[PDB]
Amino acid sequence: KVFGRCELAAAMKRHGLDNYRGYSLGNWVCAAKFESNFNTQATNRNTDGSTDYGILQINSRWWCNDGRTPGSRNLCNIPCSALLSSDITASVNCAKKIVSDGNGMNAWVAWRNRCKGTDVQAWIRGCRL
Ligand SMILES: [Cl-]
Ligand SMILES: [Cl-]
Ligand code: NA
Ligand SMILES: [Re]
Ligand SMILES: [Re]
Ligand SMILES: [Re]
Ligand SMILES: [Re]
Ligand SMILES: [Re]
Ligand SMILES: [Re]
Ligand SMILES: [Re]
């Protein structure tokens, strides 16, 4: 599923991401735009052989299992394919675990380079939240 801007924000907010670990909702919307283009089915192979999955491009090196990243872990205890569902529950729950591991949203390269420090609230303006 390809989410619309405000449709995704509402879903992320419904799933507990607004101010989760002190990150306002716009941070999560901004990151998702640059990571996945709001497309739950996004996949990208990393140089190390791992793969990023879903609307937040969660990585199989640490977080999910895709049966082709040897020597990796599965800290979210989920198949990476669950992160591509139209239901964003799997991605939100795993993102909550990632953002709590001490590095905050710096785990997301797109956020670090294109959202961190900007007016991320502009990503939720107009949305009826
Ligand atoms: Cl594996
Ligand atoms: Cl933080
Ligand atoms: Na893995
Ligand atoms: Re919906
Ligand atoms: Re929805
Ligand atoms: Re909010
Ligand atoms: Re990415
Ligand atoms: Re990545
Ligand atoms: Re703003
Ligand atoms: Re509200």
Side-chain angles (χ1 to χ4, degrees):
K1 171 181 180 171
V2 175
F3 276 86
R5 200 185 217 186
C6 288
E7 181 185 17
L8 187 56
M12 288 174 154
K13 184 180 201 171
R14 275 231 77 219
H15 282 269
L17 280 189
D18 186 13
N19 258 87
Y20 192 87
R21 301 293 289 177
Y23 289 92
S24 62
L25 185 61
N27 285 290
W28 301 97
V29 175
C30 180
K33 172 59 187 181
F34 296 131
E35 290 292 352
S36 70
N37 218 10
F38 298 145
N39 178 8
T40 68
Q41 297 192 266
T43 58
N44 286 285
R45 261 257 217 204
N46 301 126
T47 38
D48 58 10
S50 68
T51 304
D52 298 335
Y53 295 89
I55 200 150
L56 283 169
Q57 287 290 269
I58 286 175
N59 197 273
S60 62
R61 182 52 171 181
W62 298 122
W63 302 106
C64 61
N65 173 68
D66 61 9
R68 68 176 199 174
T69 314
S72 79
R73 296 172 64 178
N74 179 7
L75 293 173
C76 291
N77 298 282
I78 57 166
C80 300
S81 60
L83 301 167
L84 306 172
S85 170
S86 51
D87 185 318
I88 69 167
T89 302
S91 283
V92 172
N93 294 343
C94 191
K96 284 175 176 175
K97 300 173 186 257
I98 300 173
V99 80
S100 306
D101 75 347
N103 291 334
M105 292 200 72
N106 293 305
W108 286 277
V109 185
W111 183 85
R112 195 167 71 246
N113 290 324
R114 311 181 66 185
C115 306
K116 183 173 189 178
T118 82
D119 181 50
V120 294
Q121 176 122 20
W123 289 87
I124 56 174
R125 288 208 225 169
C127 305
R128 51 236 198 183
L129 296 140

